[PDB]
């Protein structure tokens, strides 16, 4: 039955079962079979055929050169999630599987290639910071106390809170939450180089942010897809910053650059980036507020 077929390990066994064809050996073979289906069969099994087309298109896409390029950048889970959404958006469902799957597969490789280009453009800038002097020039430029700390507090945790609060134009209860979270992560020993930990912080810092999918920009824009940007942030902190360790006094900068520069969240990137910078600073017994020039140099967004 359909329920049995859905639990197969891939579209190949699923197709073999549904199409009663043991000669189907690849996901391309499965897609090529769609043109051969009689019209009544296509109507009576429309729901399952939509699932199977999506599974087979996804599998084909993950083995393309661009699919492997994305895998290299953001890893298996993230590329699979992305591949499914692109197939849903561009794959054309059962009707396109019947009529012209190769056209769809080609179009989706162009979508993936655009995404790869955009992630790599951010990556050149962000990983480039590991070879720049972040203590001179703009990378060093600071903010006058009076711009964010009118009250004139001296304790570094309160100064960092004021800086974050001012940058987010945060008020009342929202500002109190920023302050509480900062104190909490300054002292809780939680590993920042862990995307799960960052998503938990983000959820409390930016409550009821909307989590909606944003796909690759193929219109001229360079914004990463939502999945792509989150995958790059994850690989940045769990991979790049571990293989190429940075100095404690520079970690905040690299976290700030990574979050905002890769667009690691659907919203509240600025708040997260500043919160991670401040936490890194405080754990290094310091707090140096960033000049706007320095923020712009770090995240590289224009």
Where do we find the tokens 């073999």?
A: 16
Q: For the chain, how many residues are written? A: 302
The enclosing H or E element of 171 equals none
Report the run of H or E that residue 231 belongs to, with start and end. helix 226-235
Q: What is the DSSP letter of 150?
A: T
Whole-number Å distance between alpha carbons of 54 and 130? 40
Tell which phi-psi region holds residue 26, choosing left (phi > 0), alpha (psi between -120 and 50) or beta: beta
Instruction: Say whether 269 counts as a known binding-site residue.
Output: yes
| Method used to determine the 3D structure | X-ray
The radius of gyration of the chain from alpha carbons, rounded to an integer in Å, stands at: 24
Ligand-binding site membership of 152 (annotated): no
CATH for 238: 1.10.3290.10
Token code pair at residue 26: 């690849």
- As given in the structure block, the two tokens for residue 109 are 């490789």
Q: Is 274 labelled as part of a ligand binding site?
A: yes
Q: Are 53 and 91 in contact (CB under 8 A)?
A: yes
| Residue 165, token pair as written in the block | 């609060």
Domain of residue 32, residue span: 1-302
Alpha helix stretches (DSSP H) within 45-194: 46-63, 65-74, 76-90, 93-99, 101-127, 145-148, 156-167, 172-187
Per-residue exposure over 168-204, b if at least 16 CB sit within 10 Å of its own CB, e if not: bebeeeebebbbebbeebbeeeeebbebeebeebbee
Report whether 270 belongs to an annotated binding site: yes
* Residue owning tokens 């189907």: 24
In eight-state DSSP terms, residue 22 is: T
Q: What is the resolution of this structure in A?
A: 1.8
Backbone angle region of 206, left / alpha / beta, with phi > 0 → left and psi within -120 to 50 → alpha: beta
Report the alpha-carbon distance of residue 252 to residue 143 in Å, rounded: 16
Q: Are the C-beta atoms of residues 60 and 105 closer than 8 Å to each other?
A: yes
Question: 197 and 190 in contact (C-beta within 8 Å)?
Answer: yes
3-state secondary structure (DSSP) of residue 142: strand
Tally the domains of the chain.
Answer: 1
User: Which of 291, 266, 264, 288 lies closest to 277, judged by CA?
Assistant: 288
18: its two tokens: 């549904």
**Any idea of the CA torsion for 134, 116, 218, 98, to the nearest 10 degrees?**
-160
Sign of the CA dihedral running 207, 209, 210, 214: negative
268 has binding-site annotation: yes
| Dihedral pair phi/psi, residue 298, rounded to 5° | -75, -50
Contact 134, 126 (CB under 8 A): no
CA separation for the pair 57, 63 (Å, rounded): 10
Backbone angles phi, psi at 214, to 5 degrees: -115, 125
| Contact assessment for residue 251 and residue 284, using Cβ atoms and an 8 Å cutoff | yes
Please state, as a whole number, how many other Cβ atoms lie within 10 Å of the Cβ of residue 135. Answer: 11
Torsions phi, psi for 64 (to 5 deg): -70, 160
CA 166, CA 258: separation in Å to the nearest integer?
Answer: 21
DSSP string of 259-294, one letter each residue: HHHHT-SSS-HHHHHHHHHHHHHHHTT---PBPHHH
Residues 6+ away with beta carbon under 8 Å from 269: 259, 260, 263
């Amino acid at each position: 039955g359909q329920a049995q077929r859905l639990q197969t390990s891939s579209s190949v066994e699923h197709g073999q079962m549904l199409f009663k064809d043991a000669n189907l050996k690849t996901p391309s073979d499965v897609l090529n079979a769609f043109a051969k289906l009689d019209s009544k069969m296509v109507k009576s099994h429309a729901a399952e055929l939509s699932q199977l087309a999506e599974r087979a298109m996804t599998e084909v896409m993950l083995e393309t050169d661009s699919g492997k390029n994305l895998k290299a950048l953001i890893g298996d889970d993230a590329v699979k999630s992305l591949a499914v959404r692109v197939v849903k958006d561009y794959g054309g469902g059962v009707a396109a599987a019947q009529k012209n799957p190769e056209v769809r597969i080609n179009q989706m490789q162009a979508v993936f290639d655009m995404e790869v280009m955009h992630l790599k453009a951010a990556q050149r800038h962000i990983e480039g910071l590991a070879s720049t002097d972040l203590n001179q020039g703009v990378y060093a430029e600071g903010l006058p106390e009076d711009a964010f700390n009118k009250a004139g507090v001296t304790n570094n945790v309160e100064r960092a809170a004021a800086w974050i609060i001012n940058a987010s134009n945060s008020k009342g209860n929202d500002a109190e939450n920023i302050t509480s979270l900062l104190k909490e992560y300054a002292t809780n020993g939680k590993d920042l180089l862990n995307m799960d930990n960052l998503k938990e912080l983000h959820a409390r810092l930016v409550p009821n942010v909307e989590r909606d999918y944003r796909g690759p920009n193929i219109s001229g824009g360079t914004l990463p897809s939502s999945i792509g940007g989150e995958g790059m942030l994850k690989q940045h902190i769990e991979g790049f910053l571990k293989e190429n360790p940075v100095a404690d006094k520079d970690l905040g900068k690299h976290l700030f650059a990574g979050v905002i520069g890769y667009h690691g969240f659907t919203d509240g990137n600025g708040r997260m980036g500043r919160m991670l910078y401040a936490i890194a600073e405080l754990r290094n017994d310091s707090f140096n507020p960033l000049a706007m020039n320095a923020e712009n140099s770090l995240h590289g967004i224009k």
